[PDB]
Each structure stands twice: as structure tokens, then as C-alpha cells.
Design a binder for this molecule. Structure first.
Ligand SMILES: NC(=O)[C@H]1CCCN(C(=O)[C@H]2CCc3snnc32)C1
Ligand SMILES: [Zn+2]
Length: 139
């Protein structure tokens, strides 16, 4: 589990969104595994607006932040699970790292701010849904 809290927005994995998220919906995209809802309180996270391919992510199944190198946001094939049919997820970045079911929502960050959230795992790989192109999160 986990979210990004920027401005009056809450960014979560679409597959983990709650009823309150759906009832206060701003934007959602199943192909990216992202959903954004509105919040009453202002958040403290800032979004990175950069070209980094190195950063650090939080892994809840290890209680640890790991440094990683990650690929550029791309259209990647993700294996069928109980949340999605085998398919192509867009704006996804891959790294080598531990990610097990329960780790989605952990933040990936660089020196500029939040880059994205854990969206996939398995095989010693971790996939991150990028948010750096969502410029409207800053307004
Ligand atoms: N964004 C997605 O399509 C994810 C939906 C939630 C489930 N996804 C995963 O990657 C899960 C299922 C297989 C394993 S092993 N460690 N994590 C996972 C895929
Ligand atoms: Zn950066």
C-alpha cells in the first residue's frame, strides 16, 4: 500500500483505490495502473520534473529503501494477476529489486522529488508507474 500526497491530490495504484477515492475521483487510467483523488488537507510530496534513471524506492516487505537504476517509461508486458489480465502497461519503468505482493504504492524518488510508485513485482524485478509527465499535479 502507499500513496503520493501532492497539493490537494492523493495518487494511488488504481487497483488499490478505496471507495472514498472513487467517490472523490480526479483522474484514473487502467493502462497505467494509476488513480488520483482529491484531499481536504494539503500534502508534502513534490513531484520530480526531470530525466533521472537512478533513484531510491521503498520496499514494505523489507522495511527498506533501495537505490536502483530504472528504465525509461515504456509500454511493457505484465503477467496476468488477480487485478489485471495479461496485458501491456504503459508509462512503466523496470528495475532489479525485490517487490512482492503488498509492495505496490511504495515511492520511487530521485534528487528532484517523487518519480512514481511501485506497480509490479516478481522475478527479482520491480516496476514503477511514472508520474513525472502529469504536470497538472503541480497546480
Ligand atoms: N500493475 C499491475 O499490473 C500489477 C497488479 C497487481 C499485481 N501485480 C504484480 O506484479 C504481482 C503479481 C505477481 C507478483 S510477484 N510480486 N508482485 C506481483 C501486477
Ligand atoms: Zn530527478
Amino acid at each position: 500500500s502507499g500513496a503520493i500526497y501532492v497539493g490537494n491530490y492523493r495518487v494511488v495504484n488504481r487497483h488499490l483505490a478505496t471507495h472514498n477515492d472513487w467517490a472523490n475521483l480526479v483522474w484514473e487510467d487502467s493502462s497505467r495502473d494509476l488513480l488520483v483523488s482529491s484531499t481536504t488537507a494539503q500534502g508534502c510530496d513534490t513531484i520530480a520534473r526531470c530525466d533521472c534513471q537512478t533513484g531510491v524506492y521503498y520496499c514494505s516487505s523489507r522495511r527498506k529503501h533501495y537505490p536502483v537504476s530504472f528504465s525509461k517509461p515504456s509500454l511493457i508486458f505484465v503477467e496476468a494477476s488477480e487485478y489485471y489480465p495479461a496485458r501491456y502497461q504503459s508509462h512503466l519503468m523496470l528495475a532489479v529489486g525485490h517487490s512482492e505482493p503488498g509492495d505496490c504504492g511504495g515511492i520511487l524518488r530521485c534528487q528532484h522529488g517523487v518519480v512514481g510508485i511501485v506497480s509490479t513485482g516478481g522475478n527479482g524485478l520491480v516496476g514503477f508507474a511514472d508520474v513525472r509527465d502529469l504536470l497538472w499535479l503541480d497546480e
